[PDB]
Design a protein around this ligand. Sequence first.
Ligand SMILES: Nc1nc2c(ncn2[C@@H]2O[C@H](COP(=O)(O)OP(=O)(O)OP(=O)(O)O)[C@@H](O)[C@H]2O)c(=O)[nH]1
Ligand SMILES: [Mg+2]
Lengths: 27, 138, 73, 534, 49, 36, 146
Amino acid sequence: DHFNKTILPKVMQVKNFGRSGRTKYTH
Amino acid sequence: KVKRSRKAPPDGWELIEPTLDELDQKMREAETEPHEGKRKVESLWPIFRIHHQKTRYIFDLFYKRKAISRELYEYCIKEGYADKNLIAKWKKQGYENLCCLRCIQTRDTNFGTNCICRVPKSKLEVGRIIECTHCGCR
Amino acid sequence: MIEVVCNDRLGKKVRVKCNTDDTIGDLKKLIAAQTGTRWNKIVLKKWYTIFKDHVSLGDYEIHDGMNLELYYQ
Amino acid sequence: TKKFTLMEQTLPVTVYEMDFLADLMDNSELIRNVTLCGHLHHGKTCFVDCLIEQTHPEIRKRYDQDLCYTDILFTEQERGVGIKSTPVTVVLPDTKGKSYLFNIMDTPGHVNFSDEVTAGLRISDGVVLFIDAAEGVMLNTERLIKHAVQERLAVTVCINKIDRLILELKLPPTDAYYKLRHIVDEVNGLISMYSTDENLILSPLLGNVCFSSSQYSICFTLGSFAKIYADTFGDINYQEFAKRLWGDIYFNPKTRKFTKKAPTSSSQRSFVEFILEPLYKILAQVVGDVDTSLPRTLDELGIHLTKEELKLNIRPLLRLVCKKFFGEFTGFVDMCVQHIPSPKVGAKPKIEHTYTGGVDSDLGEAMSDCDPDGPLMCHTTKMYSTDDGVQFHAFGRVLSGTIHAGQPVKVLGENYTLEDEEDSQICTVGRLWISVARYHIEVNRVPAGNWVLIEGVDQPIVKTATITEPRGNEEAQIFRPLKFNTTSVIKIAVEPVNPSELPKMLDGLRKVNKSYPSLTTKVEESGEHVILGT
Amino acid sequence: DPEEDAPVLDWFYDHQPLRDSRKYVNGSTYQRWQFTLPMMSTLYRLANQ
Amino acid sequence: WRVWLFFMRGITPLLERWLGNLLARQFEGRVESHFD
Amino acid sequence: TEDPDLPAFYFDPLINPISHRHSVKSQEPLPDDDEEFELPEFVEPFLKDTPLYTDNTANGIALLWAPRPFNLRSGRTRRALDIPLVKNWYREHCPAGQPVKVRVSYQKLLKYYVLNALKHRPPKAQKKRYLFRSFKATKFFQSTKL
RNA sequence: GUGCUCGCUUCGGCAGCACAUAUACUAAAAUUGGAACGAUACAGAGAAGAUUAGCAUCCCCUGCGCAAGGAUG
RNA sequence: UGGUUUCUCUUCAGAUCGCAUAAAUCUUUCGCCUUUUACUAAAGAUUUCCGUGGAGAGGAACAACUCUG
RNA sequence: GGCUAAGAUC
RNA sequence: CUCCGAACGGUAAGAGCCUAGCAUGUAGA
Ligand SMILES: Nc1nc2c(ncn2[C@@H]2O[C@H](COP(=O)(O)OP(=O)(O)OP(=O)(O)O)[C@@H](O)[C@H]2O)c(=O)[nH]1
Ligand SMILES: [Mg+2]
């Protein structure tokens, strides 16, 4: 969480080949 | 022990208060008895023996002596002083001194019959000092 | 603040976030708050190296993500 | 048949289909062609179901959900507004009650669906409209009053949903008569726009107002409630001297005097002391205390309620106690006296406003009896559809004639029936019968007055058309098309997704133009198929 | 209080009369239960919160 | 309480098939070439 | 009803009243009253006017407009795992303010409200019953109460 | 054991009538034979390969497997 | 005509059988993907389980209180 | 003894 | 803005010695 995660291109939630959940928590 | 109703039991309960307390203290001391001495099912024998004497005290006070009121009789059967099924089997003329309600079950025996508890000694064999393992006595 | 993951055997694996200068006695209180045992009966181990009860986390160089094999005493 | 509802194995009826239904269609003096209009949701389609439950022994009433049998379309049951009128023919007895043909047609009441009302009003005779007693007049009530009086038809108001004034507002009965008089003054005040019925004023003393409750199955007309009073050991000359319970005040001293004076300081009118006072009391006795004094009020009013009916909820027990008390809807005796002027006998201005003259050849011919006119005098004004959607069915009231099965009819079109005869396209109409809400009769003959569902003569018909026999017709003037009294201002274009299905959308736009009258599909010059809507 | 909750005094306090009341009999082994009009009227006052 | 009572209501038909074989092993003891 | 001091049927102050109610001119006795003066009447009215209007009216009418649990006069079995007690204000457009936690919690609770009713609506046929009742009829189990 | 016999017939009892008809891998037992890849001490995965591969034609263990994996002729 | 209950067992359930609602399987779809199971939810139909509804059969409690007619 | 890319093959 | 993951793919490979928590309830003379 030390990164700002806004300069990053679209989204990087988990880069470990296990993204079952597809959410960003705005809806 | 907690009465588990808190509903102001009527008259006659104080007349049967120390008698039922002595039977309840006997069963609680029998429940705290260790498993030593009893072979396999002999430890459950004082559990039914204290339960048989507890049902005989309420039934004699209601049917035989007829001193207790019916309102105190229904409060005693609801609080757990005596089982309603044990008093129902004793109402019939065919069974008045039955050992336990488990011995009267027809599906309990492997051969599909009754136990030795519900059998008179004159109709039985000559040499037999057997006791009912499920019920507890004859 | 390092996120030490006290990952023992048989499913007991929890995350424990503690300060760098925090002592190991404060870490066992946080590890017991996620595992459900007494903090006095928890012994942390890393290949037969039983940790002490008075040494800070900054002395062991336990960085973020440095997992520990939890055991019970 | 997953398009609309239909019959269910020929459901029975208290009226005989041959001894009573066949004889009523021949007698033109007892026809009573009516058409209900109502407001948007004033309980008109549900009220026709109450007449079915009073006539048919099909007990499927409002136990949990409603029993709207007039709305046959599946979209009408899902949306709940109804987009198609359905003619209903049943046997509603009067107070004497021998037999009435009761040619009714329940039209929807949405403001955009005014074209279906103008099709039914220009075809039927009776214009008995329903007003919700909770809201009063509305936008649909003002447009229907101007449309009915301009068509030279009758008028008879009926304050429906009268249970909302007691069970949903808790209004006092003294103020309820002041509110009910505000409706009748506003309805008669709105009726004073077309100055042609100044002697025909809508009033409950003249038998025009007919109280009812479509939600809870009640009827409190002045003729019917007096007959229910005299039946309960009254013997006080029902419908002969009981026409004084409006404005007059009864008094227990001088009990044989319905004077107009006010003896006591708190003594309301006779309507709020003999009619609305028990009606507020009977609803309060069942919905207020169902465990105490409920059989006491039922035995005092003479209502033998069984133990199974006593074990119901508060809503169906209120409807079952009212149905056992009132019973048959005898309130339409006032709707047969003040209204329903017996078509083919007293329908002389009806043919004068529909046909384009036709003096000495068709004016005296169509105003004559059913049989001896001869060229069948047919005029359809609504094109229904079957379960397949392809084969259409016509619907119209025969003015004077009888073409049963064999005789074909030249389908006189809208523009192809003038002195310059363009096309007729005559065909044999052999599948003509009488229609109901859900069931469908199978009749051979078809006299005047009744609504005939002619089949097979609807393919060269795109709008309200006429049908006459080609056996010597003198080519009279055809009927005028139905003015919808509302211009379809909204226009939405429609084009298929795949462009290869161009005649498939063109054939569907032609069939949709025959169903809805106001839908005038005008093909634009740019090739875009437009559709005008309300 | 025994002023507004009078018909629901003893019935709304335990689970054994909730299914085996046997007063205005309601199917003693937890069957279809039938109540009165002020019995459900005092019920709706507590459920309105 | 409602969600986790339904969790055991779905696992009670499940776990008899999940752990049914686990309690049973302690007493029972456990391409295109085909077309050519 | 705001308070049970008002009577059974009462003209509520939150009702737009009838303004005139004097459109007719009948200060003098009408000639229809003298015409109906030869109409006698001595019988009882259409209902027995021995009681009043109503005693328990405010409690009874409000119970009629009550929702599905508080309106039926015949209580069924209705298992404790079948009375949700949370969907009464879940599918109701609840939040007046704006919490960020309440928005997705109301959206997800309404999601499983639809999804358990959209495709999960079978006729629910079955053939078997009495699973644990077969164990009670065995020769080894025994029933008691504790 | 429970209730009754116009029984002996006292009312202390006896005899008869009616109901109740076969529980129990039987014991608080007797012995009988042994398994950690578990610690400790010894040396410490070679500091080095010329056939080029799979598919089907008999069983133990991990796992909940109508997924899967090791060993196999 | 004549019985309020309670427990056992025999069918069909096309009624929100359930005014509320779980899991697994099969055939198609998406996201991650690195071997696999545990994965995300859109459609449809097959079981299991939590339960229930009318109608005959056998026991117990006042069946006698006399219920409707 | 069959199917596998004259099975690829100096 | 608060959507929190678990196992397998992993510790080898062996030599001599040492000690343990376990299980069956028999027909026979
Ligand atoms: N509770 C109650 N509801 C009523 C009563 N009368 C009418 N309604 C309601 O009013 C609604 C309107 O009646 P509909 O059957 O739809 O007929 P309609 O008034 O012509 O309305 P549309 O069909 O939409 O044209 C019905 O659905 C009823 O729910 C009543 O007396 N009591
Ligand atoms: Mg309608």
